[PDB]
Design a protein around this ligand. Structure first.
Ligand code: HEM
Ligand code: HEM
Ligand code: H4B
Ligand code: H4B
Ligand code: 3AR
Ligand code: 3AR
Ligand code: ZN
Lengths: 419, 419
């Protein structure tokens, strides 16, 4: 039956039945809870050595095809049954199968719809799908990505999109983007122990250098694309500068803000996740949506492990930077968030504030429970890194489980690659 | 073995072995996660009808006695073995047993030390224990509580303390405080649909009225003590006003802040939890520590389901109160937090800001892993309702499990009481 779920802000009660359709075991044990683990094996889908067993594949394929045709208003049994038969024959004859374009589209949106850590899921149906399942070379990958970045950016009017490269076969010819995001700044560990740029890309940045890339040693040096096609070693490609849209940071009151020399890319695109559907796994499917202010303002700029600009902004605000109890951090981070939002709007780059994001997600979660009696949600990721209880999602109890289709994490390509 | 746990702010890794000592099953399933549930049955310890089975009691009692004597630097096998024998005889002869004062003290501090939702646990060893296991009447309960409130308040220099009433026997003669907190404001649903006071005490407040208490219908009317002794019906007692220390709210810049007419009690004391130790359950053991700013500033004052004063403060700050994306809520809530801290310090009432609290907890969590290879922690409760990622605990992965001794929740007394 259903798990009773409550919203303490409204007192509203919901019944989750959808959690029944969950697959394998999640992160938490029978007597313990590992919900605050960032990368649990339950959310990861690693390497392959041989094809996936027919006994396993077929059952999943049937289920997905059933899910697909099931999502239709006005059924099509005929086509449905015909498709079931066709897929079976294909698995029998080929050892796998191919999704129709419409099923891929459906699958990409469902996997998004089933992403528990995503707060923008109310947009799940508005998604552009670029079919690159035909791709054969890295150069071709590079071309597909450039087309993706260009379409997505749309001169600042960001559009959600995903590019689907070839599915995994024997797992010995994997298409993979060694990048965590299509566009990201490099991090360099200076000779003086210092760190210039984004400390989070330190390892990858060093990899790019090892792959022959030339380090510019700047705080905001966009990293190269490191593409691996058909199991082949990775080839490094520079992204055409004209394609990378950026926003320079400035505050609508503090004119000294510009003097910080801050900026960020406008396109947030996850590059290293794997799409799972009907038995199939796509280890290469970069997708993107648009930014939520706090991602840049709070995390990227203020994380102690990222740009860490919070004390500097505090000093320039003339705050009691040495009195933790003065709440100067609360003050600074809020002004940084205003700079980030204001700067995007000014330059006409689509962005969304955390309050608005939280509010729309609640609307979505309600549609979901009403539509399919549930919505997989990770409270720990869905609550903004600032203003927690000030947002409605904080007061909402939720269930986190892995359905299918789904976007999994993967093991760092350079850790599991036979050069 | 150990569960590897990481802190993404420092990159530091920890090994949790302590989770091994966990008892029953927690909240989360094998394929689902219910970590965001406020009141899971795994954290609740309900009513009793008959004594607790000797087969169950004895094993737990032995374990606790072993834990107790084990916590000693320089062992005392002799006394240890002697105590094991004495407790056994007692269970055999009486059908239960009594803890020595020192074991009760030890047990109250361990149960605190084992509270995953508590951020002040670095103070776990500094706790005053008032032994009221001899109490027989409500009047006596009322006297013990008054003594507790007086000792704890200490004219503003708050001291942590707990009062332990008689343990449960057959569960048909339970000592219980029908209150959620020793000191709390009443909530009244006005005739006009409105709500005056604290909306969170609406039901209880109505109960008090039903028990003959006279409603003053004010925004800050301290509620009466509703004590139930030896299974007897609850008797209502007014708390001596002189004993309830309060702080009037005022901002160190906005002089209009006082015009809001806000104030809060200085003593946060949980009244309705149950202490569990060596097979024994104490359904009545009010305890207290001191406030952390955000509890009042963010939750009590700004929760939409509490006093909900956030838009009013926003208007009086002249903020774009109708433009959610302006981040006015971030601005107001921060000033309210400054009012709350400033007002407590001004009136010399012990209080702690969330930044300082988060920092000390990290120090504690480190002592714990180093001391006993673990620390049960609920990330969802331990992260402040504001400034999330700005605090170190947000970047710390943690394991949540129920050890013993432990402070459990209980079912609302008025739901399970034979009048
Ligand atoms: C259109 C607006 C969108 C917004 C505003 C949005 C917002 C977010 C945010 C705030 C995160 C948190 C990232 C972090 O904290 O590191 C996230 C994660 C995620 N989103 Fe969305 N999202 C959007 C679109 C998408 C799209 C188009 C997809 C996929 C087709 C998607 C899939 C996911 C997944 C899988 C994660 C998890 C990433 C991870 O675990 O690192 N999102 N999203
Ligand atoms: C001395 C300083 C203390 C501080 C600053 C502190 C702080 C906190 C805070 C912030 C909460 C959150 C309450 C909420 O959000 O509703 C909490 C919960 C809790 N604390 Fe502590 N605490 C302190 C002392 C104590 C003491 C003395 C005990 C017990 C002997 C204790 C046991 C617990 C327990 C069981 C909870 C859970 C309450 C619930 O689930 O509603 N704390 N504490
Ligand atoms: C340890 C903890 O799980 C980790 O810091 C999480 C918390 N919540 C988060 N939420 C989002 N959206 N993104 C993150 O990176 C994190 N980090
Ligand atoms: C739904 C969710 O569990 C609930 O709102 C929690 C979140 N974290 C919390 N954390 C603390 N300290 N106190 C609370 O009351 C809550 N409420
Ligand atoms: C990839 C689609 C979802 N994208 C998104 N809203 N942001 C999450 C990734 C960007 C990352 N949080 C950053 O600020 O660097
Ligand atoms: C009871 C000991 C722990 N107390 C404490 N620090 N606060 C939690 C209870 C008070 C509650 N959060 C309130 O602001 O109304
Ligand atoms: Zn869990």
């Amino acid at each position: 039956q259903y798990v009773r779920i409550k919203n303490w802000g409204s007192g509203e009660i919901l019944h989750d039945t959808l959690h029944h359709k969950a697959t394998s075991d999640f992160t938490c044990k029978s007597k313990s809870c590992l919900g605050s683990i960032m990368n649990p094996k339950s959310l990861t889908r690693g390497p392959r050595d041989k094809p996936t067993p027919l006994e396993e594949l077929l059952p999943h394929a049937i289920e997905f095809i059933n899910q697909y045709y099931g999502s239709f208003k006005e059924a099509k049994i005929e086509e449905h049954l015909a498709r079931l038969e066709a897929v079976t024959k294909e698995i029998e004859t080929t050892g796998t199968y191919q999704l129709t374009l419409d099923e891929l589209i459906f699958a990409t949106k469902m996997a998004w719809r089933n992403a528990p850590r995503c707060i923008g899921r109310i947009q799940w149906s508005n998604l552009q799908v670029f079919d690159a399942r035909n791709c054969s070379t890295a150069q071709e990958m590079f071309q597909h990505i450039c087309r993706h970045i260009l379409y997505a950016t749309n001169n600042g009017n960001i559009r959600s999109a995903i590019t689907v490269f070839p599915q995994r076969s024997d797992g010995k010819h994997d298409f993979r983007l060694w990048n965590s995001q299509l566009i990201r700044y490099a991090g360099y560990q200076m000779p003086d122990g210092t760190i210039r740029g984004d400390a989070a890309t330190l390892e990858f940045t060093q990899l790019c250098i090892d792959l022959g890339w030339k380090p510019r040693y700047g705080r905001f040096d966009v990293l190269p694309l490191v593409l691996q096609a058909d199991g082949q070693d990775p080839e490094v490609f520079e992204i055409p500068p004209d394609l990378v849209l950026e926003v320079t940071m400035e505050h609508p009151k503090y004119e000294w803000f510009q003097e910080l020399g801050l900026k960020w890319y406008a396109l947030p695109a996850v590059a290293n996740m794997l799409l799972e559907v009907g038995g199939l796994e796509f280890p290469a499917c970069p997708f993107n949506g648009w930014y939520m202010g706090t991602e840049i303002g709070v995390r990227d700029f203020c994380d102690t492990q990222r740009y860490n600009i919070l004390e500097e902004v505090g000093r320039r605000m003339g705050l009691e930077t040495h009195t933790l109890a003065s709440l100067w951090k609360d003050r600074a981070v809020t002004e940084i968030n205003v700079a980030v939002l204001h700067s995007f709007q000014k330059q006409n780059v689509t962005i969304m504030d955390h309050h608005t994001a939280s509010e729309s997600f609640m609307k979505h979660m309600q549609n979901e429970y009403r539509a399919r009696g549930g919505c997989p949600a990770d409270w720990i990721w869905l609550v903004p890194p600032v203003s927690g209880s000030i947002t409605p999602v904080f007061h909402q109890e939720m269930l986190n489980y892995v359905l299918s289709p789904f976007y999994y994490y993967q093991i760092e390509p350079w850790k599991t690659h036979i050069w």
